[PDB]
């Protein structure tokens, strides 16, 4: 029997992905600045 569980893992996982997308874009910006 499945018990009721709190799972906000979808929204937290979407936040984690967006913060990784931001990291890659910041690295690209900083690449451009150094050059």
């Amino acid at each position: 029997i499945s018990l009721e569980r709190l799972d906000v893992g979808t929204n937290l996982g979407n936040a984690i992905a967006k913060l990784e997308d931001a990291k890659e874009l910041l690295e690209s910006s900083d690449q451009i600045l150094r050059s």
């Binding site: 709190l6 929204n11 936040a15 913060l19 997308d21 931001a22 990291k23 910006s29 600045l33």
Partner: protein, 47 residues
């Protein structure tokens, strides 16, 4: 010469700033998703 180098450097800054603005938008969207997660914790507690 110096005006050409300065044009090139302006192009560089513009590309960087455009990229920086996309990074910011990604963080802004991460924030919207974090607000939804905290709303989900509140709803689970009130039930």
């Amino acid at each position: 010469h110096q005006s050409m180098l300065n044009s090139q450097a302006i192009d560089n800054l513009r590309a960087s700033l455009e990229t920086t603005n996309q990074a910011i938008e990604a963080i802004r969207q991460a924030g919207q998703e974090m607000i939804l997660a905290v709303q989900g914790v509140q709803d689970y507690i009130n039930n």
